[PDB]
Amino acid sequence: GSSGSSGKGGQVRFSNDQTIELEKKFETQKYLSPPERKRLAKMLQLSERQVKTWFQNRRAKWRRSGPSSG
C-alpha cells in the first residue's frame, strides 16, 4: 500500500527499448565520445543530438541524486 511512484514528466522523445539502453549506458559512462555516440545513434536508431542531449541532461540531474559532494 504505502508503495508509491511519480514522474512521467519531460518533453523527451524515445522508444521503450531505446530508453532502456539509453540509460543502461549513461550508468557505465555519464558521457560518450563522438566515436561512440555516432555508432550508438545507429544502434538505437536515435540521432546524435538525441544521444548528446539526453545524456547531458541526465548527468545534470544524476549529480543532485548522488551524494557525491565534490
From Swiss-Prot:
The chain holds residues 138 to 194 of 270 of the full protein. Liver and promyelocytic leukemia cell line HL-60. Keywords: Cytoplasm, Developmental protein, Differentiation, DNA-binding, Homeobox, Nucleus, Phosphoprotein, Repressor, Transcription, Transcription regulation, Wnt signaling pathway. Changing residue 59 to A: Loss of nuclear localization. Changing residue 58 to A: Loss of nuclear localization. The lineage of its organism: Eukaryota, Metazoa, Chordata, Craniata, Vertebrata. This is Hematopoietically-expressed homeobox protein HHEX. GO terms for molecular function: DNA binding, bending; DNA-binding transcription activator activity, RNA polymerase II-specific; DNA-binding transcription factor activity, RNA polymerase II-specific; DNA-binding transcription factor binding; DNA-binding transcription repressor activity, RNA polymerase II-specific; eukaryotic initiation factor 4E binding; protein homodimerization activity; RNA polymerase II cis-regulatory region sequence-specific DNA binding. It comes from the Eukaryota. It comes from Homo sapiens. Interacts with CD81; the interaction prevents nuclear translocation of HHEX. Interacts (via N-terminus) with SOX13; abolishes the SOX13-mediated inhibition of WNT-mediated transcriptional activity via competitive inhibition of the SOX13-TCF7 complex. Interacts with EIF4E; the interaction inhibits EIF4E-mediated mRNA nuclear export. Recognizes the DNA sequence 5'-ATTAA-3'. Transcriptional repressor. Activator of WNT-mediated transcription in conjunction with CTNNB1. Establishes anterior identity at two levels; acts early to enhance canonical WNT-signaling by repressing expression of TLE4, and acts later to inhibit NODAL-signaling by directly targeting NODAL. Inhibits EIF4E-mediated mRNA nuclear export. May play a role in hematopoietic differentiation.
